[PDB]
Symmetry: C2
Subunit: 104 residues, 2 copies
């Protein structure tokens, strides 16, 4: 219902040649998208500490929280978009993006 | 807090009723396993992912990486995996501290 969250889950493996400073700047820019994208309300990210997925190799997670029933197209065309944008789409060796409403 | 995150793809044979059963049963583990804090799950709506990719996300909150492991080895979790592992084709597990 109203006020339900729409979440994106970004699942990343960075290319070997991406530097630690580059990764940090990427996450910093993503967190700040909240201030730029009206429908975007939260960004939290994390580094996996367990490494139990064998050969899949994903290491980082970004959780993006959006308001529901609001356009997010300004995010889709934003230069910083991890999949579509010119700025960061070269950073990842592997990338998955999911779009779901959390429920219980 | 820390997050135990599950990304899963069900086996092709699994029905909608069985996915509902899977998540109802899993969410109820919070009533049984002391270590668990909140559980949320959701279905991916991305058309790109649906044919062959992962389809469902489960988020579980824990106090620490230690209490994630308390959950992992709890009899009720061992039991859950024993009889519901058959439901998934593959999964990804991540344990991390969210930050901004």
């Amino acid at each position: 219902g109203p006020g339900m969250a729409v979440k994106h889950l970004i699942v990343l493996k960075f290319k070997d040649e991406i530097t630690e400073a580059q990764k940090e700047e990427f996450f910093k820019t993503y967190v700040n998208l909240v201030n730029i994208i009206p429908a975007m309300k939260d960004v939290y990210w994390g580094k996996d500490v367990t490494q139990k997925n064998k050969e899949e190799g994903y290491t980082h997670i970004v959780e993006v929280t959006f308001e529901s029933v609001e356009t997010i197209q300004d995010y889709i065309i934003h230069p910083a978009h991890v999949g579509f944008g010119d700025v960061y789409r070269s950073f990842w060796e592997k990338l998955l993006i999911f779009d779901y409403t959390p429920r219980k």
